Structure formats: C-alpha cells, structure tokens
C-alpha cells in the first residue's frame, strides 16, 4: 500500500462517517442547555471518529461502524463530563424547583405553567429551561456511567471473550423499565425512543416543559438507581 493510498483510504473513511458524528451530536444536543454549541460537540465528535478510524483494525462494516459510534459518543460525553453538570449548585436548583412547582400546584390547584415557575423562582423561562436541561443531563451522564460499568467491568471478559452478549443489558433494562410508572415511561418513550426534546414532549402532552422536564429527570433517577 502506497503511503498516498493509505492516506486516502483513511481520509475517505473519516469522511464517510462525518455524518455519523453529526447526527450523534445533533441528537445528544436534544438533552442539553440550548447554550451548548453544537459545533463544539461535532468538533470533539470528529476527534473521536478519527481516533477511532485510526486505532481501528479491519472488521465488518457493521462491526466497525459500531466501534465508530462508541468512540464518537465517548469523545463527546467525555467533553460534556468536563463541565459543571454534576455541580452541587445544580443538585440544589433541582430541589428548589421541586419545591416551587409543588408549592404552586397547591397554591393554584393545577400544573404551573413554566412561566409561573419562572416568575416564582425569579428567573427567565429561558433560564428555567437551561437549568432543567442541565439537571436532566446530570442524570443522563450519571446514567451513562451505568452502561460504562456494565462493560468496563465485564469487558475484561470482552476480549478474553471477544456483541450479542450485550443483549444482556438489552434485557437488563426491560427490567426496571417494567418498574417505570405508567406516566414516567410515557415521557421516556416520547423523549428517547421517540427522539424528542422536552419542549416538544410538553406539546405532545399539552403540559408544561417544567412538567415533562421533571418527569424525565424523575425517570432517569429511577432507572439509574435500579440498573445500578
């Protein structure tokens, strides 16, 4: 293989999977504060796609591709993990918004429109939202590490035993997912299986964003706890 021929095989690859980085990022964004630049995501995304193509050994287009994703995503999360998502300041904002929403459900005898919660918290609806998404993502990440343990822990017997086995976790979820309250499951499915943002979910349920938002965050917390 002429160095130029190699140089091109690589290029044309990194290039063929660029779109994968794209969607992954575009998707992982549906769970993040609007202020997170997707560009930034895609950037780190690429990094990994390369690192992947690079440290890649021939495999089947199906098997290879699986590795790519698992590296793109990795790249990205690692970046996100670097931010203040786990901060205590966020775990607090959680509790506080819980109060506020409860305090108004009673005070008004109904589900507080986002803005009611906004005003009652003395912040923008915009602000409220970014904060909910941060909270949520904290769990999304907390929950990430769960699948990182159901692997990095067993994976030691992953090369010593080098995909259809993962269908263990695939079923290990149908477990706590059975333990997911008729409401919580309805949101999750609408968010994940449906590829949908909290804002859109609240529209498909004619409810509040803060409402759906609190549900998701509730759900994940469960799933995290059970699958953990």
């Amino acid at each position: 293989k002429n160095p130029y021929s190699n140089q091109i095989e690589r290029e044309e690859l990194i290039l063929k999977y660029l779109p994968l980085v794209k969607a992954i990022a575009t998707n992982i964004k549906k769970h993040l504060p609007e202020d997170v630049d997707i560009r930034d995501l895609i950037s780190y995304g690429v990094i990994g796609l390369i690192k992947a193509v690079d440290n890649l050994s021939t495999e089947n287009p199906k098997r290879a591709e699986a590795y790519i994703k698992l590296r793109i995503k990795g790249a990205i999360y690692d970046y996100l993990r670097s931010l203040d998502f786990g901060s205590r300041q966020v775990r607090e904002k959680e509790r506080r918004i819980k109060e506020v929403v409860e305090k108004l459900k009673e005070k008004l005898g109904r589900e507080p429109t986002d803005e009611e919660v906004a005003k009652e918290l003395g912040i923008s609806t915009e602000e409220l939202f970014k904060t909910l998404d941060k909270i949520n993502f904290s769990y999304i990440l907390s929950l990430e590490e769960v699948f990182r343990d159901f692997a990095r822990d067993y994976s030691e017997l992953i090369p010593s035993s080098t995909e259809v086995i993962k269908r263990e976790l695939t079923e290990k979820v149908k477990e706590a997912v059975s333990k997911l309250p008729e409401r919580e499951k309805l949101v999750i499915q609408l968010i994940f299986y449906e590829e949908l943002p909290a804002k859109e979910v609240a529209k498909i349920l004619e409810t509040s964003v803060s409402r759906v938002s609190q549900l998701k965050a509730k759900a994940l917390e469960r799933l995290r706890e059970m699958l953990s």
């Binding site: 140089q7 690589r10 290029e11 990194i14 290039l15 660029l18 980085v21 794209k22 575009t26 998707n27 997707i38 560009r39 930034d40 895609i42 950037s43 690429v46 990094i47 390369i50 698992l70 929950l143 990430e144 769960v146 699948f147 993962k166 976790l169 695939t170 979820v173 149908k174 997912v177 059975s178 997911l180 008729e182 499951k185 309805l186 999750i188 499915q189 609408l190 968010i191 994940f192 299986y193 449906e194 590829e195 949908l196 859109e200 529209k203 498909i204 349920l205 004619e206 799933l223």
Partner: protein, 72 residues
C-alpha cells in the same frame, strides 16, 4: 460539501492551534444542514392524534430500545 469537507479533513490530517481552527471549520461545515427541521409538528401532532386517539402504546421494549439505542 464533500468538495470542501474533503479539503478540510485532509488539511486537518496534514498535522493544536490551527488544527483546532481547521477543526472548528469542519464543525462549522457539519451544521450548515440545519434544515433537518422536517415534520416540525407533523410527527408530534400525529403522535398526539395517536395519544388521545389511543394509537400509541408504551411497550417497555420501545422504551428500552430508545434507552439503549441512545446510551449505546
């Protein structure tokens, strides 16, 4: 698109300051297709039309698909 994207991917691989830039430029190029918009409601109004009209079921499967297909 590929015309330029190619240029850059290469430009990037020939070598990070400028790279972070070259990279930053690739990132820029990958979003231009913001037009993904599609079914901006249709997919939702349809769902609701199938939410109240009992045409949407919460099978732990679908819920588990989503959860996995995302987390993995």
């Amino acid at each position: 698109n590929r015309i330029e994207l190619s240029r850059l991917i290469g430009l990037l691989l020939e070598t990070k300051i400028e790279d972070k830039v070259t990279l930053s430029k690739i990132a820029q190029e990958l979003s231009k297709n913001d037009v993904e918009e599609k079914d901006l409601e249709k997919k939702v109004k349809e769902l609701k039309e199938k939410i109240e009209k009992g045409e949407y079921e919460v099978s732990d499967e679908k819920v588990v698909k989503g959860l996995i297909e995302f987390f993995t």
